[PDB]
Amino acid sequence: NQGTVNWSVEDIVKGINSNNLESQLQATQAARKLLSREKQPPIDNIIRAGLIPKFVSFLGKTDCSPIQFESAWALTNIASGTSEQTKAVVDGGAIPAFISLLASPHAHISEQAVWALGNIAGDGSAFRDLVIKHGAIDPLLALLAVPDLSTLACGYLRNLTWTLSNLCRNKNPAPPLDAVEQILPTLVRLLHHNDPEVLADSCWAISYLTDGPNERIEMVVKKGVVPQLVKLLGATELPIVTPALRAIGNIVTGTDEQTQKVIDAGALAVFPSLLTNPKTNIQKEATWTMSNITAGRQDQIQQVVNHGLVPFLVGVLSKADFKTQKEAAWAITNYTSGGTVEQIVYLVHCGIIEPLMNLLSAKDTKIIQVILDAISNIFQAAEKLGETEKLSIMIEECGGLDKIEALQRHENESVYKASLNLIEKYFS
């Protein structure tokens, strides 16, 4: 193979322009190797030399499967570059040619075409939709139509899963409803596979599909994946937990009923671990997820209480990355706006007040507004119990009054309005 190593582009062009298929093959392989080096593959040089149309025509040479493979790989690597470089591959007519290769008798060639289409679809909504219009989905799914996924080569299965997840990936617009419905059954199946990378990408795909309007969430939830997601939520591999949690988080941005599916599946039992997870991002996303659950019904808030999660929210509020603490503030405001008086009182018994007040020192304006809303909802709860006096004292002897008073000097309009109000109304 050293005979095709380090060719100049002009030598590649010379070979590809010969009338000799073997010479063209050697030149295409030399191109693949150029495009396969680690540092600065000369993608722009190869494009500028006008090689793409030739590579595309080589995709069609059924009688020379080696030049199909070499050109497929060269084009994959071009398509992996910038949008402009992917566009050059698409403009050369590569999409239908790669789709035709999906059914190749040679596994390594089929797989190469899968990868290329994943790069093209991954560029954005429009190329994703163009790949779908050219009819990629049927042949892709047919490659996974086997009794047991384990009989497929591991690398081959991972590539197929990754490409399918790109077909589920972008928005503005989201994938066509019809394409999602066609893909979902195979996705649900991959989501039960034992390989961690297949599971990671399957979850990523489900998370993409559940990121949008509630109707999108519903067509996923209706397939019965929620229990499997919750299981994966407890995996040890961070690459699996992260997308599982993203999908669960998206699903609870939906209706009360969609949210109840997640609770019934047992998700809340995993949040003591997630809300203390060593990975900052897992904590953040877990707290975000909790904030949407506490925005639910009172019976849903009650299950958060029953699962002992309020002390975990007090914990995050007391100490966490600031973005996570802001999410915790939201979780508390949502809880306090939707909860019963008894649930709200309970919050106070768990120690929510002091950490809440300490966060009034944050420079961020939004979290300050959020916290003042929470404090108002709590005072409101204490008015119905005639214990506003006692609450006022709590807030006072932990530095709270100093915070709220200072917030009258605060720049933002909505802040001083809520602050001054709290003072005159509960602190005379």
Binding site: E38, N119, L238, S291
Partner: peptide, 16 residues
């Protein structure tokens, strides 16, 4: 007040 989200696999991969 539900709030939509609005280490993932990469959108593109080169084969080396």
């Amino acid at each position: 007040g539900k709030r939509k989200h609005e280490g993932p696999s990469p959108v593109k991969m080169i084969k080396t």
